[PDB]
Design a protein around this nucleic acid. Sequence first.
RNA 1: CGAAGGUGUGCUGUGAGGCAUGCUGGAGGUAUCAGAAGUGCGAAUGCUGACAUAAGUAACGAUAAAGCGGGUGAAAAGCCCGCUCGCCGGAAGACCAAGGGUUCCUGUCCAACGUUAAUCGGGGCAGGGUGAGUCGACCCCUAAGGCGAGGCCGAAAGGCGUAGUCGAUGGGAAACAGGUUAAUAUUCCUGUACUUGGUGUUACUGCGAAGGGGGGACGGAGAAGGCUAUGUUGGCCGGGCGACGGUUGUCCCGGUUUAAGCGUGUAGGCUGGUUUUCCAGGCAAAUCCGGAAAAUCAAGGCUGAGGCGUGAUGACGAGGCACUACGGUGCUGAAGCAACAAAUGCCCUGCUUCCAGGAAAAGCCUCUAAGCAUCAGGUAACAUCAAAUCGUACCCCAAACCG
RNA 2: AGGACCGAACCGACUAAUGUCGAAAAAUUAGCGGAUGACUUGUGGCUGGGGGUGAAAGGCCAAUCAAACCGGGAGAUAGCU
RNA 3: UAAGGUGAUAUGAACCGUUAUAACCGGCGAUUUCCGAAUGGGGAAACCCAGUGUGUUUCGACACACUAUCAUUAACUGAAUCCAUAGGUUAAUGAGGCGAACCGGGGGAACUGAAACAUCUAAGUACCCCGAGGAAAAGAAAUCAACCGAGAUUCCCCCAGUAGCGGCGAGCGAACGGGGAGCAGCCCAGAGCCUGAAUCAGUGUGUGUGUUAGUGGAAGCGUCUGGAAAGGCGCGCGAUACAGGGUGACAGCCCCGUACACAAAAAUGCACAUGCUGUGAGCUCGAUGAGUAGGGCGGGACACGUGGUAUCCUGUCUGAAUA
Lengths: 93, 17, 17, 46, 63
Amino acid sequence: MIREERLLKVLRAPHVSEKASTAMEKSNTIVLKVAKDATKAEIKAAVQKLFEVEVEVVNTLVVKGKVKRHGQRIGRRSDWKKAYVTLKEGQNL
Amino acid sequence: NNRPVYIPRPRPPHPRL
Amino acid sequence: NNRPVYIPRPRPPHPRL
Amino acid sequence: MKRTFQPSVLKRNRSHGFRARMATKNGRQVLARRRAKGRARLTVSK
Amino acid sequence: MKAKELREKSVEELNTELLNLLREQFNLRMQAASGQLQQSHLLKQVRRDVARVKTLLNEKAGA
RNA sequence: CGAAGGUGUGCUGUGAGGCAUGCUGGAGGUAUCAGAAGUGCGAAUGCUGACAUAAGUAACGAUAAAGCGGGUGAAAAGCCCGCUCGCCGGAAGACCAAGGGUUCCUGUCCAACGUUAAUCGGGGCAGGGUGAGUCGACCCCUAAGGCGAGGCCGAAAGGCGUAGUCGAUGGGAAACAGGUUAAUAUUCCUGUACUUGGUGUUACUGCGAAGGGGGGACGGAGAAGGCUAUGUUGGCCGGGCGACGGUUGUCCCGGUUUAAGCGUGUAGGCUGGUUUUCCAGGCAAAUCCGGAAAAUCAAGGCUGAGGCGUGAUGACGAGGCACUACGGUGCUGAAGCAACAAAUGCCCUGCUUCCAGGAAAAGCCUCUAAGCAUCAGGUAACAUCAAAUCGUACCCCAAACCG
RNA sequence: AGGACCGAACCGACUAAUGUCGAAAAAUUAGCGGAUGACUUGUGGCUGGGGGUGAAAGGCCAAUCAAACCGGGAGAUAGCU
RNA sequence: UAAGGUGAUAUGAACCGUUAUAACCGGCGAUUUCCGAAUGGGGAAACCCAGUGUGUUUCGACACACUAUCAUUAACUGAAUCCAUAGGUUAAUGAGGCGAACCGGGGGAACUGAAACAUCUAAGUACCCCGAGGAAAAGAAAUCAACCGAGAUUCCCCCAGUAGCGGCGAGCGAACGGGGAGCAGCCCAGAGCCUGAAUCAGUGUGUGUGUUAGUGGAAGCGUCUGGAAAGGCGCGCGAUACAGGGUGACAGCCCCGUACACAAAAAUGCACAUGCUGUGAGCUCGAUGAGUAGGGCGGGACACGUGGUAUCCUGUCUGAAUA
């Protein structure tokens, strides 16, 4: 079985921003970066195991990369996916 | 953290920064 | 520094006939 | 003034897309010529 | 360390592969993203270790 | 203790040239005699780059229009705030598709870009920003048309086409109101709903298809009726009576808003119902459809906007109050009705007429074959779970699309 | 009822002026024609160059059409400049 | 091999290693997302949606593998009619696509030249299509020659712009023969006798050599100018190493190298020896390629355009002899 290490790989990092802080303090939701595919079921399962918390629902979105102008060369940032994980009344982190 | 990006030397008519 | 690509058709000349 | 070029992603792909080119042999030859020339954009696509 | 686990059985070597991913791999990535990971060479070391363990599993299991 | 090259000067040869040297330059150059040529430029409306000319000339892209004060700044006709003036208002407003692809918002910068200046910007740099079981795509079905197993045909390539499989510009299950962010919401929050499947339980039951039938399923024009969106007026509630005369009055200003769903089911429209018997038709079968028979009642059934209840003693709500990084924040919150007018919108895929006679398939309903009937499967109720994936910023009659 | 009438949207382009190194490689301004039809329009398909399409002008077929465009034969040939 | 490293634009941060499991280089393995012949189906390439078979924490839901078409073979099934066949399913093997030229075959121009232009030329060229290899094709005389002889094919130099063909115009243009490169001949259409009887092909072992990392590799100092000498001046040294490159101006002797002498755990090419498997000598006798040769009509290839036109090939209609 490889569901285990898959859950250890779908999370990538947490997202920090004033919207992220506002969501956490008001709606008790934490926004974090996830893998490219990172289906909602996998994100929910990963949050359950790693953070030993309970989640109401997970809704994701895909953030398109920006086109940046470095020197005399053009380049595009890599796309990534962020998920708004919603916790129940009881939360830890 | 990676604040330094190593900005390259720009053109003679470059943004004054 | 591209040389002019589209040259318009010359204006029709006065009929010297 | 309606200019000649009226963009449409669906029609563009179905006329000059990769799958359209490979369907017929001549389009396959076109892809071969592009590859030999080493063009970065082999065909038109998002 | 490369031959230290070469004489390990599948079960125990599979376990340490599990531990390498669960601890020191997920936790390190969170620290690096949050910015409290002063030393980054751990990420390189752990990733290579996971690869080294993983290849032995394939080399041992099956062929 | 200074090559080639560059820039001067002085000599010399009949000429193309040669020699010497000053300055610059900085490391290559080459006698003589031979050999080999991409061996000599002023023209080809020659090719490429650079720079003049006209010339500080035309122009600065709708004759909708600006003025003043304050603020920031080195600098303000152009930026921000305020007070006036003017323009659009079936648009120069507000939302989408197509197409763009971060142009969105915040901080910061003014070289280049903007036909001027610029503190400003759709410009440069950094960060942030797109949240869906119900919206759309994806998905199920199909039109034109494409491809096309075998197959037919063709020097080869290949052409045509059956079974099939693709193809929305069409058909098919489900959400509304309020609030919130500098930037997203029918996606987040609150309130109240709905739909399609999986699993389990309980009570009943014959189930069962690429097969049959029904339905889906359709033109133009025209008219009337019943309604709503919406508007006007009155009442009601709150505020005002006023710097140039009058204004407590029939006075003046503002507000008088509330959905989906559920219940009742109305105006209107369609069709006579029910029972029994029989039948070579529906390429097999059939309790279904169709047809033929009688008995009995004159009534049911289907469809159906709006209204009225519930949703909701909830939300919203003028205004007032308390603090302002002086942008705004928090608190409170009365009335919330009636009449009239009225659509190109709904009843209406309706109705009445006309010839030009006005898609298909699936979901859906129903009947059976093979096969299974102590099963499975189906129906009803309850419980539980699932509804993934992609689009979601912004422009969208325009400075962001095509020119 | 109507290839009916007047007239906006919409489609068209008859007259004049402006504009011809224009705002625009056929436009603007003021009038004008059709406006329930042989109408107009969105989306997607089909017809490919000695061919297509054409209420027929040698018109149209990506600002080019009495034979499109691109590459090749090809450094075609030029008793001419 | 190693005391230095973590590719570059391209500094830093945080680390590894220094006598050997840092890094680097070579051999052999592992990993090898999605698109693409794309091959589970479809599709607007890098996307969407499935079936089946194997294994699994909450039924939840996951993991792995397989599932295209065509050709050949085998098995299992199976119509119109008994049999049968077509057909259907399964398994095995192969094919598919890409790639600069060269090679063979199937098609095949026009411009141009002839001072026009139609036979002709351009030209079997450009181009299109198919197939194969490292080369391909061709090829062991039903050939030439001359009644003297030569003995497969291919390529180069002559013969030779000769003989010929040709609106006898423009142009095309051999052969015989001579000199070289390189050499190789065999089998089936069949029976008997004798039976691994040679030569080959597919695979092991051993030997030699090559390839994929490498190692050692000689010999100069002093003064002058100068920012700095490799230059000037003086005196030396190595050389089977003054081929090259770098080094603060031009280096045989500063560095990397070169001449030269060595090295391969592993994986491979070639040349031999030695085994296994498969096909196969030699002798006797016999046979000795029919819708073919040839012919009529129409075309093509041959230098040779139907001309007196031999020879080859073909569409069409005919049709022998066999030693």
